[PDB]
Design an enzyme around this catalytic site. Structure first.
Site, PDB file in Angstrom:
ATOM      1  N   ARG A  33     105.332 -13.010  38.649  1.00  0.00           N
ATOM      2  CA  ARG A  33     103.991 -13.497  38.565  1.00  0.00           C
ATOM      3  C   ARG A  33     103.359 -12.618  37.732  1.00  0.00           C
ATOM      4  NH1 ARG A  33     102.736 -17.138  42.585  1.00  0.00           N
ATOM      5  NH2 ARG A  33     100.831 -16.122  43.265  1.00  0.00           N
ATOM      6  N   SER A  92      95.475   6.059  32.179  1.00  0.00           N
ATOM      7  CA  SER A  92      94.387   5.321  32.936  1.00  0.00           C
ATOM      8  C   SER A  92      95.103   4.597  34.177  1.00  0.00           C
ATOM      9  CB  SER A  92      93.623   4.321  31.968  1.00  0.00           C
ATOM     10  OG  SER A  92      94.433   3.403  31.530  1.00  0.00           O
ATOM     11  N   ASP A 111      89.772  -8.721  43.137  1.00  0.00           N
ATOM     12  CA  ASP A 111      89.381 -10.015  43.499  1.00  0.00           C
ATOM     13  C   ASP A 111      88.205 -10.333  42.964  1.00  0.00           C
ATOM     14  OD1 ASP A 111      89.015 -12.524  44.802  1.00  0.00           O
ATOM     15  OD2 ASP A 111      90.540 -11.955  46.296  1.00  0.00           O
ATOM     16  N   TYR A 156      92.603  -8.861  54.472  1.00  0.00           N
ATOM     17  CA  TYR A 156      92.729  -9.093  52.910  1.00  0.00           C
ATOM     18  C   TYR A 156      91.469  -8.543  52.357  1.00  0.00           C
ATOM     19  CZ  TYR A 156      93.638 -10.687  48.325  1.00  0.00           C
ATOM     20  OH  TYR A 156      93.516 -11.146  47.241  1.00  0.00           O
ATOM     21  N   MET A 164      88.908  -6.916  53.499  1.00  0.00           N
ATOM     22  CA  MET A 164      88.634  -5.555  53.677  1.00  0.00           C
ATOM     23  C   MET A 164      89.135  -4.665  52.808  1.00  0.00           C
ATOM     24  SD  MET A 164      88.648  -5.667  57.661  1.00  0.00           S
ATOM     25  CE  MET A 164      88.063  -3.787  58.028  1.00  0.00           C
ATOM     26  N   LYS A 170      90.726  -5.408  49.760  1.00  0.00           N
ATOM     27  CA  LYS A 170      90.209  -5.651  48.450  1.00  0.00           C
ATOM     28  C   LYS A 170      88.855  -4.949  48.061  1.00  0.00           C
ATOM     29  CE  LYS A 170      93.619  -7.609  46.259  1.00  0.00           C
ATOM     30  NZ  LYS A 170      94.552  -6.916  45.397  1.00  0.00           N
TER      31      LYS A 170
HETATM   32  N1  LIG Z   1      97.369 -15.196  41.966  1.00  0.00           N
HETATM   33  C1  LIG Z   1      95.837 -15.197  42.310  1.00  0.00           C
HETATM   34  O1  LIG Z   1      95.270 -16.306  42.360  1.00  0.00           O
HETATM   35  C2  LIG Z   1      95.202 -13.887  42.444  1.00  0.00           C
HETATM   36  C3  LIG Z   1      93.631 -14.328  42.661  1.00  0.00           C
HETATM   37  C4  LIG Z   1      92.909 -12.772  43.021  1.00  0.00           C
HETATM   38  C5  LIG Z   1      93.753 -11.809  42.999  1.00  0.00           C
HETATM   39  N2  LIG Z   1      95.062 -11.624  42.853  1.00  0.00           N
HETATM   40  C6  LIG Z   1      95.450 -10.113  42.758  1.00  0.00           C
HETATM   41  O2  LIG Z   1      96.255  -9.998  41.613  1.00  0.00           O
HETATM   42  C7  LIG Z   1      97.370  -9.059  41.854  1.00  0.00           C
HETATM   43  C8  LIG Z   1      98.774  -9.883  41.475  1.00  0.00           C
HETATM   44  O3  LIG Z   1      98.598 -11.428  41.906  1.00  0.00           O
HETATM   45  P1  LIG Z   1      99.944 -12.209  42.419  1.00  0.00           P
HETATM   46  O4  LIG Z   1      99.781 -13.646  42.804  1.00  0.00           O
HETATM   47  O5  LIG Z   1     100.965 -11.901  41.304  1.00  0.00           O
HETATM   48  O6  LIG Z   1     100.612 -11.221  43.720  1.00  0.00           O
HETATM   49  P2  LIG Z   1     101.653 -11.711  44.671  1.00  0.00           P
HETATM   50  O7  LIG Z   1     102.574 -12.707  43.892  1.00  0.00           O
HETATM   51  O8  LIG Z   1     101.138 -12.417  46.097  1.00  0.00           O
HETATM   52  O9  LIG Z   1     102.142 -10.316  45.256  1.00  0.00           O
HETATM   53  C9  LIG Z   1     102.569  -9.222  44.086  1.00  0.00           C
HETATM   54  C10 LIG Z   1     103.879  -8.382  44.593  1.00  0.00           C
HETATM   55  O10 LIG Z   1     103.294  -7.486  45.694  1.00  0.00           O
HETATM   56  C11 LIG Z   1     104.421  -6.924  46.396  1.00  0.00           C
HETATM   57  N3  LIG Z   1     104.232  -7.065  47.699  1.00  0.00           N
HETATM   58  C12 LIG Z   1     103.751  -7.683  48.779  1.00  0.00           C
HETATM   59  N4  LIG Z   1     103.921  -6.852  49.976  1.00  0.00           N
HETATM   60  C13 LIG Z   1     104.390  -5.866  49.635  1.00  0.00           C
HETATM   61  C14 LIG Z   1     104.750  -4.582  50.462  1.00  0.00           C
HETATM   62  N5  LIG Z   1     104.685  -4.299  51.477  1.00  0.00           N
HETATM   63  N6  LIG Z   1     105.169  -3.419  49.536  1.00  0.00           N
HETATM   64  C15 LIG Z   1     105.471  -3.640  48.409  1.00  0.00           C
HETATM   65  N7  LIG Z   1     105.231  -4.709  47.618  1.00  0.00           N
HETATM   66  C16 LIG Z   1     104.786  -5.845  48.354  1.00  0.00           C
HETATM   67  C17 LIG Z   1     105.513  -8.310  46.097  1.00  0.00           C
HETATM   68  O11 LIG Z   1     106.832  -7.792  45.726  1.00  0.00           O
HETATM   69  P3  LIG Z   1     108.398  -8.126  46.156  1.00  0.00           P
HETATM   70  O12 LIG Z   1     108.290  -9.635  45.380  1.00  0.00           O
HETATM   71  O13 LIG Z   1     109.277  -7.155  45.235  1.00  0.00           O
HETATM   72  O14 LIG Z   1     108.647  -7.988  47.637  1.00  0.00           O
HETATM   73  C18 LIG Z   1     104.858  -9.131  45.323  1.00  0.00           C
HETATM   74  O15 LIG Z   1     105.790  -9.783  44.305  1.00  0.00           O
HETATM   75  C19 LIG Z   1      97.549  -8.769  43.499  1.00  0.00           C
HETATM   76  O16 LIG Z   1      96.832  -7.789  43.791  1.00  0.00           O
HETATM   77  C20 LIG Z   1      96.456  -9.845  43.796  1.00  0.00           C
HETATM   78  O17 LIG Z   1      96.088  -9.660  45.305  1.00  0.00           O
HETATM   79  C21 LIG Z   1      95.771 -12.560  42.513  1.00  0.00           C
HETATM   80  C1  LIG Z   2      87.404 -17.579  47.741  1.00  0.00           C
HETATM   81  O1  LIG Z   2      88.589 -16.519  47.425  1.00  0.00           O
HETATM   82  C2  LIG Z   2      89.678 -16.381  47.142  1.00  0.00           C
HETATM   83  C3  LIG Z   2      90.358 -17.535  46.257  1.00  0.00           C
HETATM   84  C4  LIG Z   2      91.710 -17.306  46.029  1.00  0.00           C
HETATM   85  C5  LIG Z   2      92.139 -16.327  46.305  1.00  0.00           C
HETATM   86  C6  LIG Z   2      93.676 -16.225  45.776  1.00  0.00           C
HETATM   87  C7  LIG Z   2      94.671 -17.540  45.783  1.00  0.00           C
HETATM   88  C8  LIG Z   2      95.830 -16.949  45.589  1.00  0.00           C
HETATM   89  O2  LIG Z   2      96.443 -17.791  44.811  1.00  0.00           O
HETATM   90  C9  LIG Z   2      96.520 -15.522  45.804  1.00  0.00           C
HETATM   91  C10 LIG Z   2      97.865 -15.381  45.578  1.00  0.00           C
HETATM   92  O3  LIG Z   2      98.744 -16.313  45.128  1.00  0.00           O
HETATM   93  C11 LIG Z   2      98.403 -14.063  45.689  1.00  0.00           C
HETATM   94  C12 LIG Z   2      97.345 -12.974  46.287  1.00  0.00           C
HETATM   95  O4  LIG Z   2      97.826 -11.757  46.440  1.00  0.00           O
HETATM   96  C13 LIG Z   2      95.911 -13.376  46.252  1.00  0.00           C
HETATM   97  C14 LIG Z   2      95.370 -14.604  46.167  1.00  0.00           C
HETATM   98  O5  LIG Z   2      93.946 -14.661  46.101  1.00  0.00           O
HETATM   99  C15 LIG Z   2      91.794 -15.016  46.727  1.00  0.00           C
HETATM  100  C16 LIG Z   2      90.435 -15.190  47.218  1.00  0.00           C
HETATM  101  O6  LIG Z   2      89.841 -14.139  47.746  1.00  0.00           O
END
Ligand SMILES: NC(=O)c1ccc[n+]([C@@H]2O[C@H](COP(=O)([O-])OP(=O)(O)OC[C@H]3O[C@@H](n4cnc5c(N)ncnc54)[C@H](OP(=O)(O)O)[C@@H]3O)[C@@H](O)[C@H]2O)c1
Ligand SMILES: COc1ccc([C@@H]2CC(=O)c3c(O)cc(O)cc3O2)cc1O
Ligand SMILES: NC(=O)c1ccc[n+]([C@@H]2O[C@H](COP(=O)([O-])OP(=O)(O)OC[C@H]3O[C@@H](n4cnc5c(N)ncnc54)[C@H](OP(=O)(O)O)[C@@H]3O)[C@@H](O)[C@H]2O)c1
Ligand SMILES: NC(=O)c1ccc[n+]([C@@H]2O[C@H](COP(=O)([O-])OP(=O)(O)OC[C@H]3O[C@@H](n4cnc5c(N)ncnc54)[C@H](OP(=O)(O)O)[C@@H]3O)[C@@H](O)[C@H]2O)c1
Ligand SMILES: NC(=O)c1ccc[n+]([C@@H]2O[C@H](COP(=O)([O-])OP(=O)(O)OC[C@H]3O[C@@H](n4cnc5c(N)ncnc54)[C@H](OP(=O)(O)O)[C@@H]3O)[C@@H](O)[C@H]2O)c1
Ligand SMILES: COc1ccc([C@@H]2CC(=O)c3c(O)cc(O)cc3O2)cc1O
Ligand SMILES: COc1ccc([C@@H]2CC(=O)c3c(O)cc(O)cc3O2)cc1O
Ligand SMILES: COc1ccc([C@@H]2CC(=O)c3c(O)cc(O)cc3O2)cc1O
Lengths: 248, 246, 239, 249
Positions: A13, A135, A141, A154, A156, A158
């Site tokens: 991802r 850097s 988020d 979660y 808290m 972020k």
């Molecule tokens: N996707 C969104 O819509 C969205 C929205 C807001 C913020 N974000 C932020 O952007 C970043 C990337 O998003 P994403 O959807 O790619 O994240 P994700 O797929 O939910 O998670 C990223 C990776 O974090 C690792 N992870 C989870 N628990 C862990 C642990 N205990 N130890 C080590 N690794 C762990 C996993 O690795 P393994 O698979 O190797 O276990 C996972 O593949 C994140 O910080 C997320 O919170 C995403």
């Molecule tokens: C209204 O606020 C939110 C909406 C969607 C999200 C997304 C929703 C989301 O798809 C997501 C994910 O797939 C992985 C992850 O680590 C964090 C994620 O957050 C976060 C929010 O705080």
């Protein structure tokens, strides 16, 4: 000599797209993973096939515990072992699940606060102690002030991550280390989520009624590590298509 | 019957003023303390002298650990067992010290993140599970302009903002309001007066620190009937300090 | 073929640097000026020598008045006249001076609110009405920690934030992105005291321009309503 | 003597609740109005029958123009003429209507939306301070200022500016002992001409009770900020919206 970067949670991802673009830009990469060993090794192969000796993997669990610091120290040490330097840290790994106020609660705390905040703090410390355009980029988020209902831990974590971003930007600036963030709104949606719920979220986004691609998140990361952001520190770039501007 | 309030770190300084003013408004109070047994007890005795059987003490460490959930559950339970109800939670206790990026680090984490954030979370969950109900969290007006080398403290206070906002949203269906009071410079530490004066001189409003009572007054407002539509708000009580550029 | 950009207050300092960098990225540019005719022309000459018929100048006072809407509409029209399109609006022009609470006051309003906020709103309107499209507003990183006695200037930059956010929401359906760049202290012994507060190296126009170039690029196609601080950490420094 | 307050746009709705509450706390009040002359006098009458010589009215159009500074000076002077002092200013008057980016002329919309919401507060603040104890200023802000209504750019701009004024004036007037704060409603009294179905759409969004704030709830936060219980509070904006600003799209 090519610079080097650690990307946490880089097997899939957004972290994978981040690793890819950093590698396409000239970086050598440490691909950190927890459980996705196949995908991690498979990505390092794909990258090493393109330029030999430019990618390694590093397994670690980023849950808070009394050995988390040694795990974080090891992630950074692996970059210095493979490449003799470590120029960029990307704190991308994240746990994300509901923790309603009304798995034991201490495990939820260790996962959601450890991965999202404490692990970034320890990585940052190890990164700084081991030290040019240095850097750190934290994945924040965009919706941190308009939180999902029942996601208090979660949220808290972020919030804490923003605090780190700011605190570390201030304290590390005199060593030449910039610290910034990139805040997705909705980007790649959960694997587990059904197709109706994904479209509910997709229709809220003002700019195009769709989620961010992983590549769009990565492009902001690429900017903040580049020479074009050399005065930028303690800044968090939202990349969410305007979603955080939309009222209830 | 009189309502009842838990105040964490209530033996001294701001938590004491908070406990006193809630008591003056007609609350029964649980005075939580960690190491300050003598001060907590001397407060409970003074309060009980004003009105019999209106103040009890509860000792607990709020450092993060595998017993923290049980400790926080016990603090809430002690208010119910003493008074039959728990209307107000004030999350005031706080560890505060530097953690430079360049005690073991995991102890620092357990103290700074436990007290400032995880303990408030656990207390909030126990408070809600057991139910003019409200929570007030003691935040920090300077959270976006942090002290050099206070990264873990700053992270804990940021997390506390997130809790304030998340709990306000989730608890609004149960009639529980959640708000914060964010001091700037209030009661200062043995800190030399010359060092105190450097902080005082930065405060636009009067060139002085907030008294404990001034912080308590905002807490009193937030728990009152005059704030019945207020949730998810954080009131700065800094004399304009957060508005002052470098 | 080549996209086109309007840069307000483009004759000197930050706006010049923005105009130069957009032009170096392959943009044709409208260089707006108010009093700096010689400097606007000299810039246009350097750019046109590099690539013929890629830079024009437009005079306009951006003070709020009964004529400001017409002036703003003509700035956008000049981009369409010269170049057949208008892809990017950079609202950079700005008046800056103190207005103590304790020039008439209504002239101060017209310049500090006009230039900093009303002209951006009218320009943004004209730009949208005429349609990778984006607008970039030059904000302030210290808007929350304002300079003493700069209330009107501060109101004007706050208002610009509100425009940035409102226009990002309302124009998103049209594919127009709206963002900002917020410098800290990029100056007009006092100079060295400001330099000394900056965490990152205790110290260019080009650094601001770099952020603008990112926000207009194909690398920012999902970014709208974002304000990128470019301050070296200054906004993080407590009193 | 009793303290005296000016409340702008005080004839009806939230401004009336604020004048009433300040009058109930012992203030003498200047009830400013623009068009609602009948409602203004009727309010001053009721307050004066509760305590004589404690309410006056003062007409002024707060649209930006070259005479606005003189109108703002006169508002403040009305309070000093009637009561010998001016302890509190509440900037409550506001024009509120859409100005789509893609009838009134645009320069009239600017003058009303920016003038009432930001310029008149700045000029009133200036006159209040120059003409000068618990002195304070309260500005009626908007809790939704970062999640704006679609097509309300000039209104949103005006309210952002007012946040800027709240901060700048808190900073600059602190040395003179004048505190400046704000109160920020989310959804309070809905527009008169909004139909019920539309009102209910907004109500249903509010987490705390699924209802709008009463005018009295807004007024309570004003009363708090002007009281001796907020003596160390300046530059703060208190949201009074029942959680509305926390709710995602
Ligand atoms: N996707 C969104 O819509 C969205 C929205 C807001 C913020 N974000 C932020 O952007 C970043 C990337 O998003 P994403 O959807 O790619 O994240 P994700 O797929 O939910 O998670 C990223 C990776 O974090 C690792 N992870 C989870 N628990 C862990 C642990 N205990 N130890 C080590 N690794 C762990 C996993 O690795 P393994 O698979 O190797 O276990 C996972 O593949 C994140 O910080 C997320 O919170 C995403
Ligand atoms: C209204 O606020 C939110 C909406 C969607 C999200 C997304 C929703 C989301 O798809 C997501 C994910 O797939 C992985 C992850 O680590 C964090 C994620 O957050 C976060 C929010 O705080
Ligand atoms: N004073 C200021 O200028 C200022 C500025 C910004 C924010 N604040 C916040 O306002 C609140 C009150 O401030 P304050 O200066 O009065 O606080 P304080 O004196 O620093 O600490 C409050 C109490 O917290 C308790 N505490 C500390 N570590 C603990 C642990 N591990 N377990 C349980 N309790 C623990 C202590 O109890 P015992 O004495 O019983 O051990 C202490 O008396 C705090 O949340 C603080 O962060 C204060
Ligand atoms: N420099 C910094 O440290 C800093 C800090 C915070 C924010 N900013 C913002 O960043 C942007 C650029 O900064 P800067 O220092 O390069 O700006 P600047 O030199 O102070 O002013 C920029 C331009 O605005 C134009 N201008 C001024 N009043 C005008 C009026 N009434 N009508 C039309 N144009 C007018 C001038 O045009 P003519 O010369 O052609 O008359 C000038 O070229 C501005 O928005 C500024 O507010 C800069
Ligand atoms: N109601 C809400 O849900 C809500 C939500 C967010 C923010 N707010 C803010 O809270 C405050 C009170 O809200 P509200 O609903 O009570 O306000 P409102 O009824 O819409 O307006 C208050 C008064 O402003 C005055 N006004 C309008 N244009 C004027 C002008 N050109 N010159 C002088 N006065 C003018 C009017 O006076 P006359 O009747 O005498 O002409 C009007 O009675 C306002 O600042 C508002 O923006 C309210
Ligand atoms: C960055 O600006 C700051 C300045 C002073 C302080 C005060 C300084 C202070 O005295 C203090 C205290 O004694 C206990 C506590 O828990 C927190 C405290 O914070 C905090 C800040 O965040
Ligand atoms: C404490 O806050 C601030 C400090 C300096 C600045 C700089 C100071 C500055 O150099 C400057 C300038 O040269 C032109 C301009 O349009 C705006 C400028 O603002 C802005 C602030 O908001
Ligand atoms: C999504 O943001 C908003 C939602 C409702 C409102 C309310 C809606 C409202 O009722 C209202 C009013 O009657 C008068 C006024 O001056 C402002 C008002 O604003 C404001 C917002 O900014």
């Amino acid at each position: 000599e090519a610079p080097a970067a650690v990307v946490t949670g880089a097997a899939k991802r957004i972290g994978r797209a981040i690793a890819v673009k950093l590698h396409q830009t000239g970086y050598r990469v440490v691909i950190h993973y927890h459980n996705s060993a196949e995908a991690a090794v498979s990505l390092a192969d794909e990258l090493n096939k393109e330029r030999s000796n430019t990618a390694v993997v590093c397994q670690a669990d980023l849950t808070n515990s009394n050995v988390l610091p040694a795990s974080c120290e090891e992630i950074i040490n692996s970059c210095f072992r493979a490449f003799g330097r470590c120029d960029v840290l990307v704190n991308n790994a994240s746990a994300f699940y509901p923790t309603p106020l009304v798995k034991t609660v201490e495990t939820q705390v260790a996962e959601l606060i450890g991965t999202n905040a404490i692990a970034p703090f320890l990585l940052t410390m190890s990164f700084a102690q081991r030290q040019s355009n240095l850097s750190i980029v934290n994945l924040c988020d965009a919706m941190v002030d308009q939180p999902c209902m029942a996601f208090s831990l979660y949220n808290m974590g972020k919030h804490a991550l923003v605090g780190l971003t700011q605190s570390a930007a201030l304290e590390l600036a005199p060593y030449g280390i910039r610290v910034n963030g990139v805040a997705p709104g909705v980007s790649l949606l959960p694997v587990a989520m059904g197709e109706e719920e994904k479209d509910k979220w997709r229709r809220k986004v003002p700019l195009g009624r769709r989620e961010a691609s992983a590549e769009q998140i990565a492009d902001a990361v690429i900017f903040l590590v580049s020479g074009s952001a050399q005065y930028i520190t303690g800044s968090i770039i939202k990349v969410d298509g305007g979603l955080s501007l939309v009222h209830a």
